[PDB]
């Protein structure tokens, strides 16, 4: 209605000319509302209409990350914010579809990944993608505002996050002991860091009809750190088998490998309660405070 033209008008002041009749809306989170549309050449676009000021400084890092990945990576797509203003952020839609279920819709047509029948190409192509991504020059990231860890900084970071969560909620004795055993085991910790995506899940992985990964979306957590974060999805969704398949493909295409790689990722998975507790602190939401204490194995009732 009055919204549609408003979009058409905002587009014109940024040199983007749309077909009024193709527009679809999507999630309007705390920060922006999303719009789908075609331009007059038939190309599909994603438009973000901000609904809060500070949209520039909030997105600066993600825009730097997206520009870096676009410059260096050629075996997968990432959003390329070729309109980047206070009024409008817009990019050409990536190829393919997000893996997994397509929620928030009528009908129940597209379902979650079937772990009994994962195509081998899925793990192989994700290993290709992560190996290329993690090889992007960290020196170039360091010239930007991204967080850049050495391997010792990544280890210290985990140590510090664990201490901060313990100070707020406490942590069960056996779990704390397991976390500290991991932190103190030199053989577990990688001796290299690389640029990660930082938010790898099924819904952030774009796939083609053969389940080849063609792109990744949602890059707000990108940083140079322990690459192990980007293997967690495979372990949680596909078990040890899917984790091992991804490690093998990554290792074979030339990604950094170390002998305790798989065991380290599983210990990092066992530190998931740190992240639940961090969200409970940041959000203040009672449900996640409850979830954080059970996951931290604090004796409850
Ligand atoms: Ca490209
Ligand atoms: Ca810097
Ligand atoms: Ca109870």
Author numbering: 2 to 302
Question: What does the published report state?
Answer:
Macrolide resistance is abundant in pathogenic bacteria, and is most often the result of GTP-dependent macrolide kinases (Mph), ribosomal methyltransferases, or efflux pumps. Mph enzymes inactivate macrolides by phosphorylating the 2′-OH of the essential dimethylamino sugar, preventing it from binding the ribosome, and providing the chemical rationale for the resistance phenotype. Mph enzymes are therefore adaptable resistance enzymes with complex evolutionary paths.
